[PDB]
Structure 1
Amino acid sequence: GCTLSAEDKAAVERSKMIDRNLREDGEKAAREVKLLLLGAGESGKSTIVKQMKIITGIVETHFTFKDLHFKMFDVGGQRSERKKWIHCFEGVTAIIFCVALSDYDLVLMNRMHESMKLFDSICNNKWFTDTSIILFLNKKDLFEEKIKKSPLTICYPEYAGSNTYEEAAAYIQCQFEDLNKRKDTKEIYTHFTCATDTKNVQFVFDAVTDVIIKNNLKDCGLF
């Protein structure tokens, strides 16, 4: 240490100052919990995000829940090549893949098959191998009345079960969860709701717990 005319030191001390603030934000860079969103259809994503916030590109959402601070990225507003910018979202802790339920019969090609292909290309991507996927199936009452009017065999030719609510819901849930080609590392969680049922938001917390805990089990020396 030759102190170099008493200004370079200042510059060096400047860097130490930088380091301090930098490291502090790095601490909060661990503290906040990330959550990508992706919906092929409209899916009630506005309904979901107004359900979360109560308690033209990236629409960040800094909602807090149960004393703990989150993030949430309403990404689907902007339209570009999904392949290029998705590795920017590497290291998110839980994808929230909201899917509409009543899109099983709108035809451009069925739209539910387009959501199936989107879930295929998001659940079998090399960047989200270690990150789970929460799966919201929205507008269930609209699906109730539309399955009371029209059958589900228009959507799937290879389905011949009962035309009830719960068997159709379990079949479409196991239809989505079958797309997991990497079952060992990630795990698609599931939920059903309509534009009500404020146990939605805490469920994300539940799922975030069931994706933080398991993730720590893959680095904390165990397993």
Structure 2
Amino acid sequence: GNIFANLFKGLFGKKEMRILMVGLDAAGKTTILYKLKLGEIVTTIPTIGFNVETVEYKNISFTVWDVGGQDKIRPLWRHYFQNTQGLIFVVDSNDRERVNEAREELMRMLAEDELRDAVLLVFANKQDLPNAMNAAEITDKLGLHSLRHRNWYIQATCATSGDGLYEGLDWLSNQLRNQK
């Protein structure tokens, strides 16, 4: 066999990568996905089902599958976990009551044998008000440091401002892609 075509394709960029869009409802997951794909904060209707979109950055097409945080859509995240390589969790630092629910949902998602090769992607959503926690308080509350055998990274991103999305994308690419 010959891999000349594969080498030629990889010389100019062949890797694409994957990503997931999960989190509690009203946690900026849809806004984060829109900012990653388009770059603007557009108001959208509640995600009754799911949102499918692709984002190309650094020569890698990291497709993001938006998943709602509704009760009827929370158990449907397992359907989108199949044929998925990445997962991004959007935390609601401004929702103290919903913080526990988001942490429980993240623990349930990470406590599945099928979702084991996907590194943790915790995004501190709603990072625009004083009530939002920092990149360490949210992780400590969610117990991201205790996720053994999982590469979890806590990043603070504001949907209105869009800051930190580039850093999170770069961290995800570094975790997934291990090439020069």
The normalised TM-score by structure 1 is 0.59
**What is the 5 A alignment of 1:21-60?**
31-54=15-38, 57-60=49-52
Pick the aligned partner of 1:208 from 134, 150, 173.
173
Gaps of at least 5 residues in structure 2 are 1-13, 40-47
Post-superposition shift, 1:177? 3.3
Higher helix fraction (1 or 2): 1
Residues 73-108 of structure 1, C-alpha deviation per residue, up to 9 Å, x if partnerless? 01227764655661652452221001111001xxxx
Pick the aligned partner of 1:174 from 140, 150, 162.
140
Residues 46-65 of structure 1, C-alpha deviation per residue, up to 9 Å, x if partnerless? 32122111265331112211
Q: What SS does the corresponding residue of 2:128 show, helix, strand or coil? A: helix
User: Aligned pair 1:96/2:88, yes or no?
Assistant: yes
Gaps of at least 5 residues in structure 1 are 1-29, 105-109, 148-164, 217-223
Which whole-Å CA distance do the structure 2 matches of 1:118 and 1:77 have between them? 9
Q: 2:86 touches 2:118 (CA, 8 Å); kept in 1?
A: yes
Residues 161-191 of structure 1, C-alpha deviation per residue, up to 9 Å, x if partnerless? xxxx65xx5233222234745x12x121110
User: Quick one: which amino acid aligns to residue 52 of structure 1?
Assistant: L
Q: What SS does the corresponding residue of 2:175 show, helix, strand or coil? A: helix
Residues 184-223 of structure 1, C-alpha deviation per residue, up to 9 Å, x if partnerless? 2x1211101222144413522331321333xx9xxxxxxx
Residues 17-52 of structure 1, C-alpha deviation per residue, up to 9 Å, x if partnerless? xxxxxxxxxxxxx95422111111311123212211
**Residues 84/53 of structure 1: CA separation in 2 closer, same or farther (3 Å cut):** closer
1:137 aligned partner: 124
Post-superposition shift, 1:131? 1.3
Q: 2:122 touches 2:155 (CA, 8 Å); kept in 1?
A: yes
195-204 or 66-75, which deviates more: 195-204
Higher strand fraction (1 or 2): 2
Pick the aligned partner of 1:72 from 64, 69, 84.
64
User: Quick one: which amino acid aligns to residue 33 of structure 2?
Assistant: V
Which whole-Å CA distance do the structure 2 matches of 1:50 and 1:178 have between them? 25
Q: How many residues align?
A: 157
User: Aligned pair 1:121/2:95, yes or no?
Assistant: no
Which whole-Å CA distance do the structure 1 matches of 2:90 and 2:23 have between them? 5
**Residues 111/82 of structure 1: CA separation in 2 closer, same or farther (3 Å cut):** closer
1:61 aligned partner: 53
* Larger radius of gyration between Structure 1 and Structure 2: 1
Which whole-Å CA distance do the structure 1 matches of 2:90 and 2:143 have between them? 14
**Residues 46/83 of structure 1: CA separation in 2 closer, same or farther (3 Å cut):** closer
% same residue:
24
Residues 87-134 of structure 1, C-alpha deviation per residue, up to 9 Å, x if partnerless? 652452221001111001xxxxx2211111101101111111221111
The CA RMSD measured in Å over matched residues stands at: 2.9
Q: 2:156 touches 2:164 (CA, 8 Å); kept in 1?
A: no
